[PDB]
Ligand binder design. Sequence first.
Ligand SMILES: *[C@@H]1O[C@H](CO)[C@@H](O[C@@H]2O[C@H](CO)[C@@H](O[C@@H]3O[C@H](CO)[C@@H](O)[C@H](O)[C@@H]3O)[C@H](O)[C@H]2NC(C)=O)[C@H](O)[C@H]1NC(C)=O
Ligand SMILES: CCCCCCCCCCCCCCCCCCOC[C@@H](O)COP(=O)(O)OCC[N+](C)(C)C
Ligand SMILES: CC(C)CCC[C@@H](C)[C@H]1CC[C@H]2[C@@H]3CC=C4C[C@@H](O)CC[C@]4(C)[C@H]3CC[C@]12C
Ligand SMILES: CC(C)CCC[C@@H](C)[C@H]1CC[C@H]2[C@@H]3CC=C4C[C@@H](O)CC[C@]4(C)[C@H]3CC[C@]12C
Ligand SMILES: CC(C)CCC[C@@H](C)[C@H]1CC[C@H]2[C@@H]3CC=C4C[C@@H](O)CC[C@]4(C)[C@H]3CC[C@]12C
Length: 998
Amino acid sequence: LKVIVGALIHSVKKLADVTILTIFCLSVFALVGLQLFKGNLKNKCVKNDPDIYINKRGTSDPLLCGNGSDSGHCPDGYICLKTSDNPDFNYTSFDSFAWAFLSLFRLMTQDSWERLYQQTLRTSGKIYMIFFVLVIFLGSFYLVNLILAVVTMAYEEQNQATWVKLKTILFGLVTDPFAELTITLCIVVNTIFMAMEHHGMSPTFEAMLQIGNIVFTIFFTAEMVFKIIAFDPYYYFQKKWNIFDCIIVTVSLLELGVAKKGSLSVLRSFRLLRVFKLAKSWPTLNTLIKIIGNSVGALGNLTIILAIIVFVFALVGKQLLGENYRNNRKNISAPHEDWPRWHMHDFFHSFLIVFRILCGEWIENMWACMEVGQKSICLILFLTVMVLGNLVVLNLFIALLLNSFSADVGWQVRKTCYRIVEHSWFESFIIFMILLSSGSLAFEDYYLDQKPTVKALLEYTDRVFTFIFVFEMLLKWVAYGFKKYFTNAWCWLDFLIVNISLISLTAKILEYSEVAPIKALRTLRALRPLRALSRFEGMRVVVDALVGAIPSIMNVLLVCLIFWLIFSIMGVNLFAGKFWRCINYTDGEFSLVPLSIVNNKSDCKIQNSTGSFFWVNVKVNFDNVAMGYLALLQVATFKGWMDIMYAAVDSREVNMQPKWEDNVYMYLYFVIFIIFGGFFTLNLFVGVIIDNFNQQKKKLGGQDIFMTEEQKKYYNAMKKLGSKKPQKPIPRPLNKFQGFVFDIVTRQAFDITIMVLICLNMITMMVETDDQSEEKTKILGKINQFFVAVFTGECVMKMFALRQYYFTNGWNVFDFIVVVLSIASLIFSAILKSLQSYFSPTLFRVIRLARIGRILRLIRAAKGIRTLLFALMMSLPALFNIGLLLFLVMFIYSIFGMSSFPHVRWEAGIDDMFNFQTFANSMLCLFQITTSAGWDGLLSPILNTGPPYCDPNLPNSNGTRGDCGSPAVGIIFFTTYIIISFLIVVNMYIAVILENFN
Ligand SMILES: *[C@@H]1O[C@H](CO)[C@@H](O[C@@H]2O[C@H](CO)[C@@H](O[C@@H]3O[C@H](CO)[C@@H](O)[C@H](O)[C@@H]3O)[C@H](O)[C@H]2NC(C)=O)[C@H](O)[C@H]1NC(C)=O
Ligand SMILES: CCCCCCCCCCCCCCCCCCOC[C@@H](O)COP(=O)(O)OCC[N+](C)(C)C
Ligand SMILES: CC(C)CCC[C@@H](C)[C@H]1CC[C@H]2[C@@H]3CC=C4C[C@@H](O)CC[C@]4(C)[C@H]3CC[C@]12C
Ligand SMILES: CC(C)CCC[C@@H](C)[C@H]1CC[C@H]2[C@@H]3CC=C4C[C@@H](O)CC[C@]4(C)[C@H]3CC[C@]12C
Ligand SMILES: CC(C)CCC[C@@H](C)[C@H]1CC[C@H]2[C@@H]3CC=C4C[C@@H](O)CC[C@]4(C)[C@H]3CC[C@]12C
């Protein structure tokens, strides 16, 4: 309505600066991509002596090539020509500016950016990960922070603007506080009783569990009867807690009366909502329930707005694409499924599509839509859903976030070592030694076997490092008292790490050097580079800030763990052991045998003529509550989410072959789990951390946290450099000719002319295209010469108009640097094109990029972009500390992975490039998952258990008998990685937000 359009106009006015920054930064990075990797994602592997392309293991699209020393290779008998198609429906390469903009929008929204990351590093070269790191940090974090801050401030400004019965009663009225404690004990034990539901529970276990359920239903019924007789029912009403318990008990007894095995497992688990009764001695659970209530209560208007928006988008998508999806389904349909797992044909699946968009995965369905129907309709619909969809969601996540959180010889002997240790020389020696030790544990990799000298040198240096660190601890002991030394947290960590190293080294010589405990002990050497958190003041202050919030993290962690236990129990009840299928694993790719041939384990055993019918289960299932937790986490991070939705919907009943969309309506379980365990237990984690820092800062004096004392004054000086200090220039300097040029320069024409010159040098290098004609190349290359000459001449006339001692007058030094860079690029291109033109052709495009300075020159004109960049400049030291810590933890887990998974089957997620064998590869993978992208894909080849998936008979990997994973450690590793990184990055968002708040 008119009110809505007026509010939108006001918001865009408030969103103008951030929108302009987004468009400009996206354009700059699009130009960088279009001038770096245009025409690289076309190197389909092809045969040589013809026109058929190999496929990547378990893939339908062709493999990709690159000639770079560190790009994707190709199998023998194949050659790497370029082909007119791009890997993913001819839509995932940025050669034209349109594709560059789209791919950089994908990188910003971090939606399936894993795919582009792997493709581009496979076709271009591993060294280009720098572009993706830079774009992820700048814009995927930066621009999201700024847009979320803008909406925050918009909301803030909106707020600113706006007798046997007598004996029974006597016995019953006790209501002693010991009765409630017994009830709570009975709830807890009942829950932990039902938390032993597993697929292969024996009949005795089933009997025991149903007996327990009967006992507890009886006990609840008896307590309800006591309560109703304790006082007359007329007063029982007006008690929400009591009526909730009444309804749940009624459902429990109704299910008990049911004699069909509790066919509705949902009803079976309806009792489990009792844990909410436990929200009386816990304040965090009460706050969570209050969050949900405000969502459904005071702030229900926004929620209904979100629901109506999603319903409208789903219905429109169906009405406009169902028939096309049905007719051309074969186009997007899997090779064997004969159908698209997602489509618009039915309201349910259109809603699921819209929900996946809101979840933040849009490109897959985007390609499907825009290769099955009109491009215009798909283009507008998917993008308009992304913007409006994720805008409304973030409005909830904050509106709820604020609503809920607005309320003697010995003396001299000791002094000897004391003054020795205090020596700055020794302090620097030790810090450098720690850094060298951290570096040393990086080349111990899968390939270290083939270089005997390197490993011998590495073990020698580790031994010497152990000895020197033992000496250092001896000096520490001598200098400081035992009590003082042991009462220090950091001293404890340095004690444990040296203990681990010493015991590992002793075990090297001693026996028992192969058992699993000692193997794990030596695996813990990856904590060795954790000694550098006290040495560095930035890391130390960050660690103190984090440890300050440990209790506030733990409270919400436990509340969320209980909520996830509830959901895992429901999931186990619903899908205990139905995630089993008979497959066709002949060589590499596999397919579910059709129901015609095999219908159940019996068939899969008798129809096994070829020997290629295996009966195996999904990697992550709902057998146990542990696997319930793991699968719930995968659905919560939105990675691996799909393989489980597929298995859940397909499964029919124990020991039966899954059928396509048998239980098509079991998507609702995952929709509900997201909506409740993913978004409502994150509005409670954020809230707690912001209410923790809001106070912790207030307590420490309100001084900016994360910044060392030394850097505090450097930041003070910088913000002092960001002040108001203008000097009036001198007219007609020196000779009148200088005055003549100066008077015209002063006018408000030179600025605008250079600016419109910089815009026409942007739109002359954006019109470039990979398949451009040679005449087009000629004209644009000459326009480039004209522009560089114009800029150099118009930069040297102003220079003369201001003598030669005006470098420090202002930002003109940047203009001088960029113009000299452009001239240098011109001359170097001229040299290479003729003199020594035999170098690699990549350098031509690398250097040709140096013309981006003429784009960076537009900053000084844009006040909003300049202010936001200044905010980044101010935040840079704190972000440097946090990034140091994050790279440190990334290093720790890099060494862990390098030691753990150097032998694994290269299933979807792990291939030759993105394995864990090399340090750089492992670093690539860990950086990938730091954003929580593709961690499921990297996890799947670790859950492999025996054939057919893995080959535990393989000669290699003596630890596991073959290239089979170890899920016990593989789940801990990735769960801890995606939790720790979330913490660090959520403290990196807080820092940026508080800096921009100043
Ligand atoms: C797995 O599913 C298949 C398909 O539903 C089941 O196949 C059917 O099983 C029944 C019972 O064994 C068979 O019935 C008998 O068939 C013989 C002839 O083969 C007939 O002489 C008997 O009077 C009786 O009708 C039925 O034929 C069979 N159908 C097919 C197509 O094979 C199978 O039993 C299931 N396995 C298990 C263990 O549940
Ligand atoms: C090495 C094992 C691997 C995992 C290590 C943990 C991961 C690294 C990050 C966490 C570091 C944990 C240790 C540092 C904790 C913060 C530091 C906690 O403060 C304790 C002392 O450092 C302070 O000095 P004192 O205790 O001697 O005197 C003050 C007395 N009060 C005030 C404490 C009572
Ligand atoms: C596997 C074995 C060797 C691990 C032993 C680790 C123990 C001894 C360490 C790990 C972390 C340590 C704590 C870290 C921080 C502090 C605060 C400070 O006031 C000293 C005591 C106290 C509370 C430490 C006590 C000892 C402690 C709990
Ligand atoms: C200066 C003229 C073009 C009018 C103003 C529009 C300018 C600023 C920009 C806006 C969007 C731009 C287009 C966006 C993308 C592409 C695809 C690329 O492969 C060739 C150039 C082309 C087609 C651009 C031409 C210039 C363009 C039209
Ligand atoms: C409303 C203002 C005036 C008060 C302060 C509120 C601050 C603390 C709020 C408003 C915006 C919030 C952010 C919104 C979204 C995200 C992204 C999420 O992945 C982690 C939490 C994080 C980074 C939030 C942290 C807390 C936050 C910065």
